[PDB]
Structure formats: structure tokens, C-alpha cells
């Protein structure tokens, strides 16, 4: 079978600036193992092809995973903007695949705060679709250059979510999987 359990029920998930991608190649895939599950917050397949999907064949499947706030999961989708879709994770407009996401307050909040999950807050430009930026070069907001020293106009580009179990559902951590379907000229392996 295709190792979709290794991505969906992993104990740890990546920060969104460092979003993880796992490749699914040469394997038989049980899609029913997901599309018969529960308390998933959202399971929209933007891939106008797959609306609920089915048992299709794909040259490869790719799973992209990360943790974002609750308010920001809107962005994990065609044509949106904001800190998450501009600076962290951006899908193309020609997207065929699904955006699976669930509330993980149970796993990713800590009494007094989990601060291990981060996002990029400053960036000189917007990401291209499926592009990743894990650099930590100080961001120059003004015109005086920074020279490795943080201060006015010289901001460390990443910020942490302050994930606490108390705050509203919109500020709570959610895990997100993004399945994308590759259709190349080659044996359909899934």
C-alpha cells in the first residue's frame, strides 16, 4: 500500500515556513482510508477535477504538511493573499488536488504556550507556487542596512505562534495536508 499513514498521523508536523513534502511513488493507494474519516475540519478539493475525488490513477501524489493558525487556513487555496499565502505557502491557480485540515489544539498547544511553530512575517517579495523559503536573513525594512544586527527596521523574519489551549478557535493550531496530483507521461503508479 501507499504510505499515507506516515504523513497523516505523524507525531510531529513542520512549521509552515518550513513546510514538508512527502512523495508517493510506485504503490497502490487506498484513498478510502481518508475520505471516510471524521472531525476533519475541512476537506475541499480545489482540483475542480476531484470534487470528492475517486479512484483515479496518478503518476505521483505529493503530500504537503504543516501547522497554521485557524483563521489562516482560508489562505491555503487558489488565489488568496495574506501572510500565509504570500510569505509561507502558496498554491497555484491551476491546482488539482485537495486541502485537508484539522484542529490540533490537543497536540500542538502547551500550558503557557507552545512556541515551536513559526511563520515568515517579512519578505521582500511573494512566493511563487510551491516555493519554500527557510532562510533567516534579517529583513531590512528601511534603508540603513542591518549588518547582522537586529533593531529598528531590522527584524528577524520569522515569528512564533503563541499556541495556548485557552485562546479562541481562530487562533488555535490546525494541521493541514495538501494532496497534489502529478499527471506525467509515464505509468500511473497510484
Amino acid at each position, epitope marked *: 500500500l501507499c504510505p499515507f499513514g506516515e504523513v497523516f498521523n505523524a507525531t510531529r508536523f513542520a512549521s509552515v515556513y518550513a513546510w514538508n513534502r512527502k512523495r508517493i511513488s510506485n504503490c497502490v493507494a487506498d484513498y478510502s482510508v481518508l475520505y471516510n474519516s471524521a472531525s476533519f475540519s475541512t476537506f475541499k478539493c480545489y482540483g475542480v477535477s476531484p470534487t470528492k475525488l475517486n479512484d483515479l490513477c496518478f503518476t505521483n501524489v505529493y503530500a504537503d504538511s504543516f501547522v497554521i493558525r485557524g483563521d489562516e487556513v482560508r489562505q491555503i487555496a487558489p488565489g488568496q493573499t495574506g501572510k500565509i499565502a504570500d510569505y509561507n505557502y502558496k498554491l497555484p491557480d491551476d491546482f488539482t488536488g485537495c486541502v485537508i485540515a484539522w484542529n490540533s489544539n490537543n497536540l500542538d498547544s502547551k500550558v503557557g504556550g507552545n512556541y515551536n511553530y513559526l511563520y515568515r*512575517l517579512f519578505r521582500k517579495s511573494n512566493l511563487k507556487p510551491f516555493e519554500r523559503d527557510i532562510s533567516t536573513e534579517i529583513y531590512q*525594512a528601511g534603508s540603513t542596512p542591518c549588518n547582522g544586527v537586529e533593531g529598528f527596521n531590522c527584524y528577524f523574519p520569522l515569528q512564533s505562534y503563541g499556541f495556548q489551549p485557552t485562546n479562541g478557535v481562530g487562533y488555535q493550531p490546525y494541521r493541514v495536508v495538501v494532496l497534489s496530483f502529478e499527471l506525467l507521461h509515464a505509468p500511473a503508479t497510484v
Partner: nanobody, 117 residues
Framework: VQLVESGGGFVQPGGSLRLSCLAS????????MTWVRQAPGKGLEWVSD????????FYSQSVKFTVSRDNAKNTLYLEMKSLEPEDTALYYC???????????????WGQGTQVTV
């Protein structure tokens, strides 16, 4: 064309303080204003913003703290209560250049006032 913080000193855990920032040289009404924090050898930490008139105030995860503005007296205030020791840093008054609250490009700021709880 400047900004001078004032207030602060040494106070005890659970004490208080009211910092002031006398602006000068510009139309204090036409701008948002900011408080940021800098512990020694660290980056800027954003504390609060306030809008032109004073009815929208945005704070960080430190409500312990209230921002006020008297655009007649060109003064920006920050009343700090229920201080912790972790609230110790140098406290800056700063004006953004051109509302998503938090750190942005600041075109003017002051010299700082030390708060050590």
C-alpha cells in the same frame, strides 16, 4: 522633528509605571504611534500601537498595559501595571512611516526610557 520618552526607573514585581513620550516637530494627530521593547543585546519587541484619535489600541500578549494619547499635549502615554521581572528592557516611542498591528518600518523613534522591574 523628534521624540523624547520619559518615565520609568526601578520598581518592584507587581509595581507600576506611566511612561510618556513628548513628540515635537510634526502633526501628532495625523500618525499612529507605537511602543516597542529592547532588552540588551536583543531585537525590538513590539508592545503596542494606537490610531490617530485614540479609540483603537492594539497590544501584544502583555495586557498586564494601556496606551493613551493626548494629541493636544502632543504626549503619548503607556500605563504599565502588574509588572513582572520579564518586562525589563528599554522602552521606545516610535512612529510608523506609512491595521495589521505589530512591527513595521519606523521612520522616527526616541532614545528610550529604562524600565527595570
Amino acid at each position: 522633528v523628534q521624540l523624547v520618552e520619559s518615565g520609568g526607573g526601578f520598581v518592584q514585581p507587581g509595581g507600576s509605571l506611566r511612561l510618556s513620550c513628548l513628540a515635537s516637530g510634526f502633526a501628532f494627530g495625523d500618525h499612529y504611534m507605537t511602543w516597542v521593547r529592547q532588552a540588551p543585546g536583543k531585537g525590538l519587541e513590539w508592545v503596542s500601537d494606537i490610531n490617530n484619535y485614540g479609540d483603537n489600541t492594539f497590544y501584544s500578549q502583555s495586557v498586564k498595559f494601556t496606551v493613551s494619547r493626548d494629541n493636544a499635549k502632543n504626549t503619548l502615554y503607556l500605563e504599565m501595571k502588574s509588572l513582572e521581572p520579564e518586562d525589563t528592557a528599554l522602552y521606545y516611542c516610535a512612529r510608523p512611516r506609512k491595521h495589521f498591528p505589530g512591527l513595521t518600518e519606523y521612520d522616527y523613534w526616541g532614545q528610550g526610557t529604562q524600565v527595570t522591574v
